[PDB]
Symmetry: D2
Subunit: 327 residues, 4 copies
Amino acid sequence: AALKDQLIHNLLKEEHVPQNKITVVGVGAVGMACAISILMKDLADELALVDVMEDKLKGEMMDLQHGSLFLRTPKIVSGKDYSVTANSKLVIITAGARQSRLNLVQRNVNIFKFIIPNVVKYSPHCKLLVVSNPVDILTYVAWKISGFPKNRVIGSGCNLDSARFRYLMGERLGVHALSCHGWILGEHGDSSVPVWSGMNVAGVSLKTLHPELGTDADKEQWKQVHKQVVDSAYEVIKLKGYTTWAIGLSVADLAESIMKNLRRVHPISTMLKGLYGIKEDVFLSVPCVLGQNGISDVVKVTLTSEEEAHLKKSADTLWGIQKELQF
Amino acid sequence: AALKDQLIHNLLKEEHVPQNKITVVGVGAVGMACAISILMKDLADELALVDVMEDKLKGEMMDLQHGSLFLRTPKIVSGKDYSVTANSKLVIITAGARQLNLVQRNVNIFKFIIPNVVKYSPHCKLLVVSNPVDILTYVAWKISGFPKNRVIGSGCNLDSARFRYLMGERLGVHALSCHGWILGEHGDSSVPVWSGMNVAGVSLKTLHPELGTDADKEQWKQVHKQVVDSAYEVIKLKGYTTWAIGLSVADLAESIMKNLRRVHPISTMLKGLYGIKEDVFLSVPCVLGQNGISDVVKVTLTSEEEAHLKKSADTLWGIQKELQF
Amino acid sequence: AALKDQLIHNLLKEEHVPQNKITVVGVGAVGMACAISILMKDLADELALVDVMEDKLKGEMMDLQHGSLFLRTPKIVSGKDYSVTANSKLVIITAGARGESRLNLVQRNVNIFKFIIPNVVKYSPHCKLLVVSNPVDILTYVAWKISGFPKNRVIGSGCNLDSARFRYLMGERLGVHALSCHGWILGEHGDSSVPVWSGMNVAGVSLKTLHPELGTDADKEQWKQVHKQVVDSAYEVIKLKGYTTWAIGLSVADLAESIMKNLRRVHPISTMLKGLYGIKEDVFLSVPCVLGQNGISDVVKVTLTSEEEAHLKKSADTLWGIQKELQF
Amino acid sequence: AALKDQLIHNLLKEEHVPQNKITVVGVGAVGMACAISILMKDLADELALVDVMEDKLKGEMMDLQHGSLFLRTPKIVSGKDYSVTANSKLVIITAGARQQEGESRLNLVQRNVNIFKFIIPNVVKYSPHCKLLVVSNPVDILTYVAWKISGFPKNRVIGSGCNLDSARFRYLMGERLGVHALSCHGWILGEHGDSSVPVWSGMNVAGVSLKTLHPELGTDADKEQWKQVHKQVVDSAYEVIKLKGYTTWAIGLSVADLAESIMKNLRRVHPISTMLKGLYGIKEDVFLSVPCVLGQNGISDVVKVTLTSEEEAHLKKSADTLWGIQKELQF
Ligand SMILES: COc1cc(OC[C@@H](O)[C@@H](O)[C@H](O)[C@H](O)COc2cc(F)cc(-c3ccc(C(=O)O)cn3)c2)c(Cl)cc1NC(=O)CSc1ccc(C(=O)O)cn1
Ligand SMILES: COc1cc(OC[C@@H](O)[C@@H](O)[C@H](O)[C@H](O)COc2cc(F)cc(-c3ccc(C(=O)O)cn3)c2)c(Cl)cc1NC(=O)CSc1ccc(C(=O)O)cn1
Ligand SMILES: COc1cc(OC[C@@H](O)[C@@H](O)[C@H](O)[C@H](O)COc2cc(F)cc(-c3ccc(C(=O)O)cn3)c2)c(Cl)cc1NC(=O)CSc1ccc(C(=O)O)cn1
Ligand SMILES: COc1cc(OC[C@@H](O)[C@@H](O)[C@H](O)[C@H](O)COc2cc(F)cc(-c3ccc(C(=O)O)cn3)c2)c(Cl)cc1NC(=O)CSc1ccc(C(=O)O)cn1
């Protein structure tokens, strides 16, 4: 008799099915930062990794597995073949091509043309969380290819940039980012919209204390805080070659709202046709209620007409780009 | 329109189907300790509480709900009606009768509770904590109709944690690093498996062959004695115990909810193993995961340790033979 | 020869000094709720409990200790003598006195603090004091006056829980988690507390701007009643289970987290606010306070209406009047 | 009036002093893995990073800082100047030189010693009372080096040693047995790497000796070849390096576990490298992994594992070998 059989008597003959499974697609720096952040938050009972770089993929799986003693996620699997991803509650897309342009978008679209059908094949009921850049466009692409209802296709959107904003705000005010509130909405990147009217500590409107807030006439140049947010990815890439930890943490926080059905409000990109004056099939970041069914509700933020037009402009540019894509 | 609708545009017709729901039956000091321990370990997306004292029940629910901001368990519900427990993955029974013929009244209690539980959560695991726990776990099992892997008694889980704590005080290292197993029938008849006690793989019995005997100058036998009495001592001091039992139950909930397949000293239907031939529940090292107990470790026992477990089997069966459901 | 010495080679002598010790005074339901919450959030490397009911005390300690395997707080101690509390970073006061009369009730709590607070200060000169005992604003004043600590190191839990309740109820009406609902209750703890309607918001969207009637008696939705619900909820729960424990426990653990981790988060807690919010007297009220390893280091100056400002002035007069009549 | 003063009234002049500060030296993949693991277990109220590559250092600091919203460590600081590490409770050394073509392994070690000769005095100067946790390889030798350079008492100089390899061993044990690593117990002791000692006698689940169930356990005559599990442990770093070019996540998790025992004074028992002269029959000043009680004063106690004659022979041999290399180093 084998030692295992001498030691342990099997009483139950049982099967598989994971109950809180999460898949990360793409094991680059971003994918793996999402992975370790999720593992250390105890968000999943099974974690699947997939990539096309099979050695890298296997090496990352093994490195995570060796840390089992220290985690509470009993199963970590990987493979080039998407069957490893079966029955995921949530699938996180961090795959992309790397730096032309617009031809860069099409190559990412071609990457998605392969990934997304495979994901939906083995997890017809998952939530899709897209992190790949450009995220608003790629999230729309995942949505179109997947055939999912819009509530289940989510883009990381402005979630990290709002967190950065709050950190910088916290630096200026001498309080933790947790206590500093402010929203960056709309199109992820240089065109994102800092909603000066919403910024506050303990319910106290900064814009009201300080009417020049966010304008060129602002002696304190709060406008530059937003630009610092917009530039920070660029600045960090410049220093270390990429970013990982913050985006990883931010993605894990979204996963928490989903897997625990918290219905917290996050600034993430959702298909918002019919809201905010927008008439195109596009994804923009607005405050969304996030739960076990993905995005079920959207907060309607009161915007200035300047903010509204800026949001409509992003929709039209996003749509303009989406028309040139081949599916 | 209502302020909610001015503030919030609804995009989805929301079905609330709980995914990782846990129920605690009985909101006494034990149930509520299990509750707060589970809430603070983030093991459920929904907690249900059930009891027959409706005022107490509603008040406890409300008190937990009020701490929502500090928790990550978005839904907490309660009621005397078991519809509130629907679709639980795990249901924890702390219900018990007010003070033999007690077990009979506890059995009567279980005759009402269990079918109500099974009706609303057909697929749940059952974790019995009520005393006498090995007997009531057998009752829960029989009444429930469930296969044996899905019915679990807290058994010697806590007493083992107590033993390791006391081991750690004597040796000067954390209980986590002191290993020792109390098995068999919960209570005074439980078995201190001297041979398995160790730190870092070093057998204490081999270092100290007198370990656990009368001739032991260090009197380690009194450590098991102290574990078996400790509950009585705490009740004497504060009227009941709560925190330790609550923490130990949350630990089991954790292995279940996260499918960890850790080994715990808990009470399982072990007919067929350890020389036992009756439908009884005794604590052995069990692999605990999303399907309950799926495997048990076969501990190498001395001939008298063996005879002691068999005696408890016949003891329990003897008591079970009287009960009626 | 001894087994321990056979198993274990000792290399280092004991210099055992606590690095992040918390004491909870009072092991009633509130006290133990704070203790269990603190233990399960790993805020302390040593916990001490003190009370005068010595059986109950020892019993609570042992029960906690039996849970060690499942905790990461290696040392739990207790005693009637305050030497067990020495070198606490944080000492939490939940002790209280058990239809006549109010002022006479307060005085007997003062009497308890006259015994407790000096004992705490003697053994933990550098600690922060966090008072939870009712009425908390007054009793936080008494702890401050008695202890002789600077005001930054004496904190009352104040309206911290009530704000948390307010956000929970806000969340139930709006269909989102309380974490994402923001509202502030300030001022005197209890039914004199002030709901600051102008700061209530989700995602920076002002509810009052959306709904100008918010919190007036001219509100078809009666949001004013949410504050009342908050105010009443404590006594409703008391009506139902005899007391409250779990939420106040978690509330206090949250404050302990900001202090022990120096988070400088903002909480609505009771601070000596003479010289702010138009308050002239030595009075403790709840305002949004920056909370960290040195206690309360900063206060957020909320913009209040003249009515709201008047409410706080009134409470300051009430509290000051009562304190005027206390025997220290 | 500045918006901040308009919004916030300052009641206290702050002289900030960190209470549970951890420093990580070296922001390579290993350093940042320790760093993220520590941050997500809330073990420090301040984290400091140091390295010689200033851009890389600043980038990593900023990336972590941008995650502040999701963390409960209010202060992350970095700099090439060791003033940023002042008053750390724990300083974790992951700095190393990488081989060339080229140079012998001794010349690679000496270049690491050269690195430590610059780092260790800087660390000791700003945090005289810290514990040192050395992770850099070869770990037993470089932990010896930090001990000697720092002048710290031995209880305060700790090498990660066989901690991770024992974790790997329990994981692989759990895969064969169908049980979580948490419930599989087994110890890799002695010199980190090839010459480490799998202590078969101590392997168990639930206190059931595997060796007693299966006396061939760990022998060549073992038909189940459990020795191959030790070889797996020994080769796992190389195997992972072949696939992804380095390891990070596991060693990072294992380091934070040690950090946890130290910062919380847990007095858990870990397989880590300590100065064991005078114990285990060792006559030399060397560091070997044995089961150590780890707390706020570092390693206060070691467990005395009963070893077979051939196990004792391996350790004493490793001692000679380490001491031999040590005598060849320039301090
Ligand atoms: C290249 O092909 C593939 C690559 C894959 O690997 C993806 C991954 O490894 C790489 O994206 C890489 O590691 C980058 O680092 C990650 O870049 C990201 C990803 C991300 F989600 C977010 C950010 C980000 C966001 C915000 C900020 C900030 O705000 O700070 C910073 N960073 C950066 C996978 Cl899994 C499949 C395919 N493809 C296949 O499945 C085959 S089909 C196909 C079709 C076409 C092509 C082709 O044309 O190339 C290739 N394959
Ligand atoms: C009484 O009726 C009922 C009471 C109920 O209340 C339950 C609860 O509140 C009480 O158990 C109370 O909190 C006890 O104190 C808790 O005692 C326990 C419970 C437990 F699980 C473990 C321990 C324990 C273990 C180890 C240690 C240690 O080792 O340290 C210490 N402690 C102690 C419920 Cl939910 C339903 C019914 N019944 C109904 O559903 C109606 S049907 C019915 C039938 C018959 C009878 C009757 O005959 O009376 C009554 N009802
Ligand atoms: C009786 O004396 C003492 C009693 C002591 O026991 C304390 C404790 O066990 C009891 O407070 C018990 O647990 C209460 O129930 C808890 O009630 C509380 C306590 C609290 F902090 C907050 C809340 C609260 C807050 C908000 C909400 C909500 O908003 O929901 C709900 N609840 C409720 C101690 Cl440690 C020392 C002395 N005293 C001594 O040290 C001797 S000196 C002395 C002097 C005078 C007197 C005398 O006048 O009698 C007595 N002793
Ligand atoms: C180059 O010099 C320096 C390098 C430094 O490097 C920091 C960092 O970036 C690098 O360690 C890099 O990331 C490595 O790759 C990481 O490699 C490691 C490190 C480690 F701790 C453990 C493991 C490990 C363990 C187990 C397993 C497994 O079991 O799985 C896998 N991996 C792998 C620093 Cl902060 C200062 C100096 N130097 C100075 O301070 C100036 S003094 C000086 C003296 C001499 C020399 C010279 O000779 O060159 C240079 N400087």
